[PDB]
Amino acid sequence: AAMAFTLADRVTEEMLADKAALVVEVVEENYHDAPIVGIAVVNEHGRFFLRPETALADPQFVAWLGDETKKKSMFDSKRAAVALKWKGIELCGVSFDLLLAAYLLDPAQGVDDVAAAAKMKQYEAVRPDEAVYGKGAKRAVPDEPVLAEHLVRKAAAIWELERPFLDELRRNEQDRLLVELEQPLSSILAEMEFAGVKVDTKRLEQMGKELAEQLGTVEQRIYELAGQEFNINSPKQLGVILFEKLQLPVLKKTKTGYSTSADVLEKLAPYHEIVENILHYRQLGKLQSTYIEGLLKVVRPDTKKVHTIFNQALTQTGRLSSTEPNLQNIPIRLEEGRKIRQAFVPSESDWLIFAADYSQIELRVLAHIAEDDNLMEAFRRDLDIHTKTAMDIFQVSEDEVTPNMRRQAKAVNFGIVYGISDYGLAQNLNISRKEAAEFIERYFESFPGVKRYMENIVQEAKQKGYVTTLLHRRRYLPDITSRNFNVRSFAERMAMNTPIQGSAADIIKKAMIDLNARLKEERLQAHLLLQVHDELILEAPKEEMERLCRLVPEVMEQAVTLRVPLKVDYHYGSTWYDAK
DNA sequence: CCTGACTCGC
DNA sequence: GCGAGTCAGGCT
Ligand SMILES: OC[C@H]1O[C@@](CO)(O[C@H]2O[C@H](CO)[C@@H](O)[C@H](O)[C@H]2O)[C@@H](O)[C@@H]1O
Ligand SMILES: [Mg+2]
After folding, report:
1. Which domain holds residue A418?
2. Residues A153 and A167 in one domain
3. Do A288 and A157 belong together in one domain?
4. Residue having the nearest C-alpha atom to atom 7 of ligand 1
5. How far away, in angstroms, is A274 Cα from ligand 2 center?
6. Which residues does a 6 A CB cutoff place in the pocket of ligand 1?
7. Cα–Cα dist A288/A205, whole Å
8. How many domains are there within chain A?
9. List the disulfide bonds.
């Protein structure tokens, strides 16, 4: 049943056709400066397998790779593009990426290999990568015979699946989403990951020492207040000290035992002086383990840069995710954690970090899609939306809005931005589910358009089986018909939240594409470094700041045209921390 | 070596 | 509402 192919010892002309399925295999999950273990090409002339050391040293092959007119169909082209960048080789002409195509057709499938994508079209003449390479300690590249056939089978599947995938995307009206948005974005993310972000390791190591000292003190104080020493990091051991030895009350209980979440401890603080210390301990320990030691582990010792990997085909909303390290969750709320950002600096002297973020893009998108007159007017006046929401919900003038009123109005808006449950609102505001319901009801009286939208989107999700975003990204919600209240309610909140969060994702992705085109036209050295959901982080010569101050916000604000303006705030400084 | 509990961002 | 990374504890 084996698949026929040529295991070539040298590159030939028929291997350089202007249309082909290409496989440039990188087995290591983290593909930065990683090995390319084999190459497979499938075209009109047949199927071929080439040894990397052979193909990558061949002028003809390298030129073919870099020729934008020679079209390649691939799976996860960013992986190959970056692996090639580290070797000084440019990959161009990728006209179809099966991973991105499968992701757009149904992000819930979790397609992470050619076999998974192929199964969507009843194509099974290819093995899952895990079956070929195993997983974990047993992971490894098999002998050439097995490797070669696997790569050729993947290339063959890609070659065969391009047409059906493109046809369904077209039917879904997502063909431009793939070709004009996700694929071009893939190349931009590849440049961003490759460039990396410079880290001041000495700065990180210094704060690391401080934390270590502060942890040691708090750690001791904790054993003193408890009368004994224990593993504070053990929610099991901590529970014993807290709810048994010290007799603190049990307010919430986890599926396995005593709940020691920050929300719980906060309520126990007044009962004993140990609680505040445990909280402070959790905090410092979080920064030390995750943002100091964890970050230092992934910095490249030679360039002192971190090279994250943006997973472009994971989230169900269209947002990107970041790993090794995750640069989308660097502290900022609390000052102590915020200082971690002083560790991220420009890659060159006399360069600066420039950060631009969308102001309330989710609520602006909601005003647009729901066409709520009150909400649209609020943004047209560029009002503080939380203060305004408080004025309406509580029926008071702007002067009458107290800090606590604004805080609660902010929580209601937050719940709308992320589509959290009524139960979630009650929990966040530490009030009763019933009182939370009253707030929500009050909100709908003030924003009837939003109310209308929420009801209409749920019905639409039930009728069509999915909801869509501004640029036609899609999310199937089969649980929307479930007779189980909880499961159904969850699907309903996703129906409400996806067009909002998803459309916000579409916009920033287009802004990134538009921005890169503008930077190139202007011949600026500035370049994108990171994207954190609603913000773009760049670095550039200090001499380009003034131009970026006008260029970046404009490009971001004009990415799309909504019924309300889009607003972008920006700052720049010597470190990421200073770009505030 | 995998799940639960925790916490960080938006 | 979720992404990711940490830890501890049980697998084994
Ligand atoms: O190259 C990223 C791309 O690969 C997938 C599998 O096709 O994920 C792999 O690589 C990620 C980054 O190293 C890991 O987080 C993940 O565990 C590994 O399977 C895709 O999900 C992703 O788009
Ligand atoms: Mg913002």
Report:
1. 361-504
2. yes
3. no
4. A112
5. 36
6. A 29-30, 76, 79, 99, 112-113, 309, 311-314, 323
7. 10
8. 4
9. none
CB-neighbour burial class of residue A202 (10 A; exposed 0-12, middle 13-18, buried 19+)? exposed
Strand B positions closer than 7 A to protein CB: 1-2, 4-10
Structure tokens at A143: 């002998």
Establish whether the CB of A490 is closer than 7 Å to any nucleic acid atom in strand C.
yes
Ligand 2 center from residue A494 Cα (angstroms): 22
Ligand 2 centre from A537 Cα, in Å?
12
Which is the closest atom of ligand 1 to the Cα of A313? 23
Closest amino acid to nucleotide C4 (CA–C1') = A326
**Contact in structure between A568 and A354 (CB atoms under 8 Å):** no
Q: Residue A531 is inside which H or E element, if any? A: strand A527-531
Point out which residues pair with A361 in neighbouring strands.
none
How were these coordinates obtained? X-ray
Residues around the ion ligand 2 (C-beta < 5 A) = A 357, 534
Residue A21 CA: distances (Å) to CA of A24, A71, A98, A271? 10, 9, 10, 66
Whole-angstrom distance, CA of residue A538 vs CA of residue A556: 13
In sequence order, what DSSP letters do the residues of A89-135 get, joined into one string? -----EEEEHHHHHHHH-GGG---SHHHHHHTTT--SS--HHHHH--
Q: Which helix or strand (DSSP H or E) is residue A323 part of? A: strand A321-323
What Å resolution does this PDB entry report?
2.0
